[PDB]
């Protein structure tokens, strides 16, 4: 799992092993958009809503299983487990250093 | 008007809202594009009002 405001290493891609910051969540297609990664050189149509619709650089959204968190206490790839003692849960980094970047 | 169930007389609030709605709808007609600042939520109030003002007939009167 992953929310909106962590940093992560991407493992399966042309740019193997690069860290950055997620911006937009996109649950609907299961995809992830990551800062400084896979700039599909969007080249839209000669519209007049999108101004002079053409080239620009917005980060193309890659699949949410190529991307994986990295352990806060170690900055190595992990999975995410969960316990709770309080109202909601607290994701435990499954490799002993527990993440409170709920924000 | 979320979660304010501590009221007896509400009808006059209703009429304020209804003349509100008529006025705001009558302008879109011309132009005036705040259609998402529009009455998609000057309407979602009125059912809160009416549901309680009517349960004040279903359970107290039978």
């Amino acid at each position: 799992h992953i929310k909106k405001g962590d940093n992560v290493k991407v493992i399966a891609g042309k740019d193997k092993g690069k860290e950055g910051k997620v911006i937009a969540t996109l649950p609907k297609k299961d995809r992830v958009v990551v800062e400084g990664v896979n700039i599909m050189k969007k080249h839209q149509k000669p519209t007049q809503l999108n101004p002079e619709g053409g080239i620009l650089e917005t980060e193309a959204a890659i699949h949410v299983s190529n991307v994986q968190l990295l352990d806060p206490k170690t900055n190595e790839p992990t999975r995410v487990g969960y316990k709770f003692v309080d109202g909601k849960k607290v994701r435990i980094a499954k490799k002993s250093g527990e993440e409170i970047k709920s924000n | 008007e979320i979660r304010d169930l501590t009221t007896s007389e509400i009808e006059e609030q209703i009429k304020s809202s209804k003349e509100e709605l008529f006025n705001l709808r009558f302008q879109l007609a011309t132009g005036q594009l705040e259609e998402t600042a529009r009455i998609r939520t000057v309407r979602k109030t009125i059912a809160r009002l009416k549901t309680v003002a009517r349960e004040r007939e279903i359970e107290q009167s039978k």
Binding site: - | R25, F26, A29, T30
Partner: protein, 89 residues
Amino acid sequence: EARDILKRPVITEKSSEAMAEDKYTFDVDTRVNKTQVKMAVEEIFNVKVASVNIMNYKPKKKRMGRYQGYTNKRRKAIVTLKEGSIDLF
């Protein structure tokens, strides 16, 4: 009531020429009569209206742009006063 019986006004090149003869056209509901509109425009605008004329409009076909569909029927009503002013533009 006297608020849900009046929807939106008609702003065309024919209604603009009726403003000189003091004749405002409105889109009322398809269930009201020619007397309920005389007690809804004389209270909301507070003006002594003279006469009122209404006409029914049948639904249209559709368009090739989308898919085979239909249009909603409308009910026009031309209200004319003789001492009041305008309440729209």
